């Protein structure tokens, strides 16, 4: 056998690789890529089959491959002529949420843990939840990349299941509160430094509808706005 077995194994691999693996990646990524001819750059094969996900506690059925387009508008005028170029933004990309600022319209509902309840809600609303090591961010000045303070930390919003600080609630100087991703700030002892953003603005962060819960839609809008600041804020590089 042996030479039979190694030949057979290389057959198997050819099976495995495209007709499970890359087929199952075609299921969303980027879903019969069209801005012109939908497959074309190289011979694929094919677009996988529908698979439906019944979504947990509540309602849902996701059938992928997704027949979907975001119309919800990409404010991007194309630099054209040699057709494969950068699409420029028509106005301020940051507010328009495009490029490194891009949000995705996910669901405008909060993600509810294993037993239908908000995954992230603020520490005010968490039963005996409090900071067990490291600087306590609450009450620190919040300073942006241009070294100017744009508020103060008021609360930590925590993921309960996998117990973790996910957001900081920052009260801007005028009682407006902004939510800010923990993965974007540097909690020191004398200030909390947000490098991605300018102080004088910060204000532009998408606002929450309830003050005690954030939706998937909103999370993406906040995080996207923040990250885009890294490119789009000339006071830093």
């Amino acid at each position: 056998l042996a030479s039979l077995a190694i030949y057979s194994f290389w057959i198997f691999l050819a099976g495995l690789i495209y007709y499970l693996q890359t087929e199952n990646m075609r299921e969303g990524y980027p879903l019969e890529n069209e801005d012109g001819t939908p497959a074309a750059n190289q011979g694929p094969f094919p677009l996988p089959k529908p698979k439906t996900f019944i979504l947990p506690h509540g309602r849902g059925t996701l059938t992928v491959p997704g027949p979907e387009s975001e119309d919800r508008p990409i404010a991007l005028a194309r630099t054209a002529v040699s057709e494969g170029f950068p699409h420029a933004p028509t106005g301020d990309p940051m507010k328009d949420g495009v490029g490194p600022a891009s949000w995705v319209a996910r669901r405008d509902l909060p993600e509810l843990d294993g037993h239908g309840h908000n995954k992230i809600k603020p520490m005010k609303a968490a039963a005996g939840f409090h900071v067990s090591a490291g600087k306590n961010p609450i009450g620190l000045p919040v300073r942006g990349c241009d070294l100017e303070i744009a508020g103060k930390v008021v609360d930590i919003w925590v993921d309960i299941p996998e117990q973790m600080a996910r957001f900081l609630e920052v009260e801007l100087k005028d009682g407006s509160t902004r939510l800010l991703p923990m993965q974007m700030v540097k909690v020191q002892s004398n200030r909390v430094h947000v490098n991605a953003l300018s102080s004088d603005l910060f204000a532009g962060i998408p606002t929450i509808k309830s003050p005690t819960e954030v939706t998937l839609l909103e999370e993406d809008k906040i995080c996207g706005y923040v990250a885009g600041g890294l490119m789009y804020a000339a006071p830093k590089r």
């Binding site: 019944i54 979504l55 990409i74």
Partner: protein
């Protein structure tokens, strides 16, 4: 999706100049540098195939300048072409890393992938730049050949007896083995969840975390296991690069004899 992301920007070196996409592939300054370098090393290998009379990949090989040349130069055919191809390999690897750095900026994403890739580069440069320079002769390095580098592997392994006994190597292996287990387990965990027992509703991280506590009695975070992947693999190749940088430079002996340090006093 894609389209809203294709905005003009990022780019370390190369200004506006190179900011375009050849289809899926972003180009950029380090994109053309990767191309330029891969073309040069391919030409020089094609050239060493011709100079030995084979175009077959089981047989095409490029070996280093033999021990007497030191860290000097060699004739292309008596060593020099491995040397030039190394420069194109290091150049083409470092461009690719800095190619990733530029796509990162444009995607407003984190630097972690180039940082991880730099470790594979470090391992490579151990064998090819650092351990030879340390040992005085480029010839200690490995030949660029599908079979002939395993020939080099077995000879250097066996020049020290059973090279399992090299301590930093033992633990490098220990991470390689743990990281594979960690991958099988992690992938299998998410697919335990996203694809539940037939007509069930999708599971939760809460289910994931609970499964691993029932088996083991702990569950690192979801964030935590991706912190774990990155570290097990970069330790496996760190300790691997150490293992192959002490041997030859400070341990010049049959590795079995290390352990006798422990074996005597009582």
């Amino acid at each position: 999706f894609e389209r809203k992301y294709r905005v003009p920007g990022g780019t370390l070196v190369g200004g506006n100049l190179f900011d375009f996409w050849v289809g899926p592939f972003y180009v950029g300054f380090f994109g053309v540098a990767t191309f330029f370098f891969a073309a040069l090393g391919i030409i020089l290998i094609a050239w060493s195939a011709v100079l030995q009379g084979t175009w077959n990949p089981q047989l095409i090989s490029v070996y280093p300048p033999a021990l007497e040349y030191g860290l000097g130069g060699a004739p292309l055919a008596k060593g020099g072409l491995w040397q030039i191809i190394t420069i194109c390999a290091t150049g083409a690897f470092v461009s690719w890393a800095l190619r990733e750095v530029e796509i990162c900026r444009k995607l407003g994403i984190g630097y972690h992938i180039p940082f991880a890739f730099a470790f594979a580069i470090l391992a490579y440069l151990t064998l090819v730049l650092f351990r030879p320079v340390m040992m005085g002769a480029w010839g200690y390095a490995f030949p660029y050949g599908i079979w002939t580098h395993l020939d080099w592997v077995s000879n250097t392994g066996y020049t020290y007896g059973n090279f399992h006994y090299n301590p930093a190597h033992m633990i490098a292996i220990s991470f390689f083995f743990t990281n594979a287990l960690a991958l099988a387990l992690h992938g299998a965990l998410v697919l335990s969840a996203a694809n539940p027992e037939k007509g069930k509703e999708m599971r939760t991280p809460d289910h994931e975390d609970t499964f691993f506590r029932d088996l083991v009695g702990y569950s690192i975070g979801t964030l935590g296991i991706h912190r774990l992947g990155l570290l097990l693999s970069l330790s496996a190749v760190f300790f691997s690069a150490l293992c192959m940088i002490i041997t030859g430079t400070i341990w010049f002996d049959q590795w079995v004899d290390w352990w006798q340090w422990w074996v005597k006093l009582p």
